[PDB]
Amino acid sequence: KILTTIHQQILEAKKNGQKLLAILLDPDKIVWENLDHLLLKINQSPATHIFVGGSIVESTIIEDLIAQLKQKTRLPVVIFPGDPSQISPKADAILFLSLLSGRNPDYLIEYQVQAAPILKKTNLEVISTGYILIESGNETAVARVSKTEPLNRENFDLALATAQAGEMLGSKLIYLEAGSGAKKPVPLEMISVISQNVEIPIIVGGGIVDLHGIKKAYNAGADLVVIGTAFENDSHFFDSL
Amino acid sequence: KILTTIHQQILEAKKNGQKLLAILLDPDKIVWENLDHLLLKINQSPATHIFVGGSIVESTIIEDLIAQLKQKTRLPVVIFPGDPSQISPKADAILFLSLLSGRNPDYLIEYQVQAAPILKKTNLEVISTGYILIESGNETAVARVSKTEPLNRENFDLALATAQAGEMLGSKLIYLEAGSGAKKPVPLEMISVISQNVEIPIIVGGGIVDLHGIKKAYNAGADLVVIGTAFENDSHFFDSL
Ligand SMILES: O=P(O)(O)OC[C@@H](O)CO
Ligand SMILES: O=P(O)(O)OC[C@@H](O)CO
Ligand SMILES: [Mg+2]
Ligand SMILES: [Mg+2]
Ligand SMILES: [Mg+2]
Ligand SMILES: [Mg+2]
């Protein structure tokens, strides 16, 4: 590869039609006795990025995990934060999320204002990300912790308007999120509608439990797919015959 | 001049050290019998932009005013909106405000999501603007209508963090706002702290009642100053000997 910001890496990949893949590691769900093996499987996988976050956990545990990732893998490590406490200076970048599907100001601006001076004392690449929670069948942790409601999974116009408002406000990425372990993944037609009508790259995650689901999301217009649960449940998820 | 987006015009002006000046016309405060004279004075003034907004008013009245401005002046007309109803397709651009000093989600994302599909059926240039209300002595209309509180005028660190979070989220401009007819304008040291520690251009307005106040704001780091009240009160405000 070449030395680039992660933002430029994603933009170039989208322009060149090259699909990206992030494995999400949730530090609260990591069994450390098995982490060495897990990182070997990440290295062997087609993953292009490692995302870290997805649970409220003490900062030291996140820092410990990120230190292992930076030692034992060569992938960019992007923090996927729920709270400013999850900021770790050892990561490469941070998705600076705003929960655009929600109307809880803590997750629209308050935590971001708290985070800004913290991020200024790090070398993290900060990538504004419009985070849109899509209803998926059961209540997810994102909705629980944020005390917000997801966007109706059949209201394509609202999901689009939300992504477009994000883009207009200056989001550099849209992340369409069904939630960790979602029963129903983000609808493919929603991915298509949004990817055809915004210009910025689209991340899709939540509820994707087989390779076919990844391919379908890509085909529908996802530029980067996130897999957490399926790889947490099976370190061999990406194995081939 | 040359044909440019307003955003690029502001960026180039900042790079070249050329200070900009907007006259704000509030359509609810316009006496129409005197508008022809008022527009002549705008044309003779050093204004580079006309901003329109600053009161809750029916859309037809805004459209009527903007039509006159587009006919009788040559300045770019930028909508300075309080609600998606104030969008008029006849303007050149719109400051797509988010009220970063406040924690009312209507003014952080809700109205922006409502606005997005409306803006998509116009040719308006949409410029993400981090709108920061600074305490100024009395309650202003911005605080009243938004049901938010302004930022303490002595808390430079918070004002900075707010502007930095805006910048990180993708704001293209910061607008430091004391409110229309403010008793105390935005502090000069606040303008300096923010202009030295964010890279995007800074608009300052609210409470500026003489030319000296404009010069001081510019000297402190404002890239563009907005004057409403002082010109509404005296069409000859910008006259020279
Ligand atoms: O764990 P899963 O369901 O793959 O979802 C990943 C991610 O989008 C969750 O935040
Ligand atoms: O009317 P004045 O006090 O000049 O303020 C202008 C503008 O900043 C108000 O929104
Ligand atoms: Mg998934
Ligand atoms: Mg999964
Ligand atoms: Mg003023
Ligand atoms: Mg004035």
Side-chain angles (χ1 to χ4, degrees), chain A residues 2-11 13-14 16-27 30-32 34-40 42-57 59-231 233-241, chain B residues 2-11 13-14 16-27 30-32 34-40 42-57 59-231 233-241:
Chain A
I2 52 162
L3 271 72
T4 317
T5 63
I6 287 137
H7 179 218
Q8 290 299 320
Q9 180 184 13
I10 294 167
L11 282 176
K14 182 175 175 78
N16 284 129
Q18 313 160 326
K19 301 296 181 172
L20 298 175
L21 178 67
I23 292 170
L24 170 64
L25 300 179
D26 183 325
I30 278 193
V31 59
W32 295 77
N34 299 123
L35 175 60
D36 261 312
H37 172 75
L38 194 69
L39 300 194
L40 196 55
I42 293 176
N43 290 341
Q44 295 170 1
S45 83
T48 55
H49 298 82
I50 303 169
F51 289 4
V52 178
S55 278
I56 302 158
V57 65
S59 70
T60 56
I61 303 158
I62 307 167
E63 273 97 48
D64 285 355
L65 174 59
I66 293 172
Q68 296 284 311
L69 303 173
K70 290 305 304 169
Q71 180 174 110
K72 292 165 180 185
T73 81
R74 292 201 183 174
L75 300 184
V77 178
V78 183
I79 296 171
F80 183 43
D83 176 286
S85 67
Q86 300 202 352
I87 295 172
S88 173
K90 287 191 165 275
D92 298 310
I94 178 164
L95 301 184
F96 202 51
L97 302 170
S98 190
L99 184 53
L100 304 184
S101 49
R103 302 295 184 264
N104 180 343
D106 279 344
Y107 296 96
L108 293 165
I109 189 60
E110 177 54 31
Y111 287 158
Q112 295 81 355
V113 169
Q114 288 183 30
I118 296 174
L119 291 166
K120 288 292 183 169
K121 65 183 80 159
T122 79
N123 59 39
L124 278 169
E125 173 183 2
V126 179
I127 306 175
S128 184
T129 301
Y131 194 47
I132 306 180
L133 184 69
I134 304 304
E135 196 275 325
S136 62
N138 304 120
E139 183 186 22
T140 66
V142 179
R144 187 173 309 114
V145 172
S146 68
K147 303 153 284 168
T148 66
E149 293 177 14
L151 297 198
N152 191 295
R153 73 189 311 277
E154 291 181 88
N155 199 333
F156 295 168
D157 285 359
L158 175 56
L160 181 54
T162 300
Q164 289 176 326
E167 181 176 44
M168 286 179 180
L169 284 162
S171 299
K172 307 295 185 282
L173 299 168
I174 294 303
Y175 187 146
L176 303 177
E177 166 78 274
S180 190
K183 172 179 89 190
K184 311 181 212 187
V186 174
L188 302 178
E189 184 171 339
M190 181 180 287
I191 301 170
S192 306
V193 169
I194 289 170
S195 61
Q196 291 169 1
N197 289 286
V198 309
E199 299 321 315
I200 54 171
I202 308 301
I203 298 170
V204 176
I208 298 181
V209 294
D210 46 27
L211 300 181
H212 176 61
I214 304 175
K215 301 175 74 172
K216 280 161 40 206
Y218 285 157
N219 292 340
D223 297 311
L224 184 160
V225 171
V226 184
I227 297 291
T229 294
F231 177 78
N233 290 348
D234 177 22
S235 60
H236 305 275
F237 182 69
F238 296 104
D239 286 356
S240 179
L241 282 181
Chain B
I2 52 162
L3 271 72
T4 317
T5 63
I6 287 137
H7 179 218
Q8 290 299 320
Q9 180 184 13
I10 294 167
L11 282 176
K14 182 175 175 78
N16 284 129
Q18 313 160 326
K19 301 296 181 172
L20 298 175
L21 178 67
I23 292 170
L24 170 64
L25 300 179
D26 183 325
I30 278 193
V31 59
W32 295 77
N34 299 123
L35 175 60
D36 261 312
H37 172 75
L38 194 69
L39 300 194
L40 196 55
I42 293 176
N43 290 341
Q44 295 170 1
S45 83
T48 55
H49 298 82
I50 303 169
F51 289 4
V52 178
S55 278
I56 302 158
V57 65
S59 70
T60 56
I61 303 158
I62 307 167
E63 273 97 48
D64 285 355
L65 174 59
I66 293 172
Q68 296 284 311
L69 303 173
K70 290 305 304 169
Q71 180 174 110
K72 292 165 180 185
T73 81
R74 292 201 183 174
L75 300 184
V77 178
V78 183
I79 296 171
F80 183 43
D83 176 286
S85 67
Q86 300 202 352
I87 295 172
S88 173
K90 287 191 165 275
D92 298 310
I94 178 164
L95 301 184
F96 202 51
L97 302 170
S98 190
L99 184 53
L100 304 184
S101 49
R103 302 295 184 264
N104 180 343
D106 279 344
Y107 296 96
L108 293 165
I109 189 60
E110 177 54 31
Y111 287 158
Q112 295 81 355
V113 169
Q114 288 183 30
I118 296 174
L119 291 166
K120 288 292 183 169
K121 65 183 80 159
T122 79
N123 59 39
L124 278 169
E125 173 183 2
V126 179
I127 306 175
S128 184
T129 301
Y131 194 47
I132 306 180
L133 184 69
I134 304 304
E135 196 275 325
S136 62
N138 304 120
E139 183 186 22
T140 66
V142 179
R144 187 173 309 114
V145 172
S146 68
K147 303 153 284 168
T148 66
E149 293 177 14
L151 297 198
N152 191 295
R153 73 189 311 277
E154 291 181 88
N155 199 333
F156 295 168
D157 285 359
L158 175 56
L160 181 54
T162 300
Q164 289 176 326
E167 181 176 44
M168 286 179 180
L169 284 162
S171 299
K172 307 295 185 282
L173 299 168
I174 294 303
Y175 187 146
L176 303 177
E177 166 78 274
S180 190
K183 172 179 89 190
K184 311 181 212 187
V186 174
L188 302 178
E189 184 171 339
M190 181 180 287
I191 301 170
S192 306
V193 169
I194 289 170
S195 61
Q196 291 169 1
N197 289 286
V198 309
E199 299 321 315
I200 54 171
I202 308 301
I203 298 170
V204 176
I208 298 181
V209 294
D210 46 27
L211 300 181
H212 176 61
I214 304 175
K215 301 175 74 172
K216 280 161 40 206
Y218 285 157
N219 292 340
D223 297 311
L224 184 160
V225 171
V226 184
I227 297 291
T229 294
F231 177 78
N233 290 348
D234 177 22
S235 60
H236 305 275
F237 182 69
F238 296 104
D239 286 356
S240 179
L241 282 181

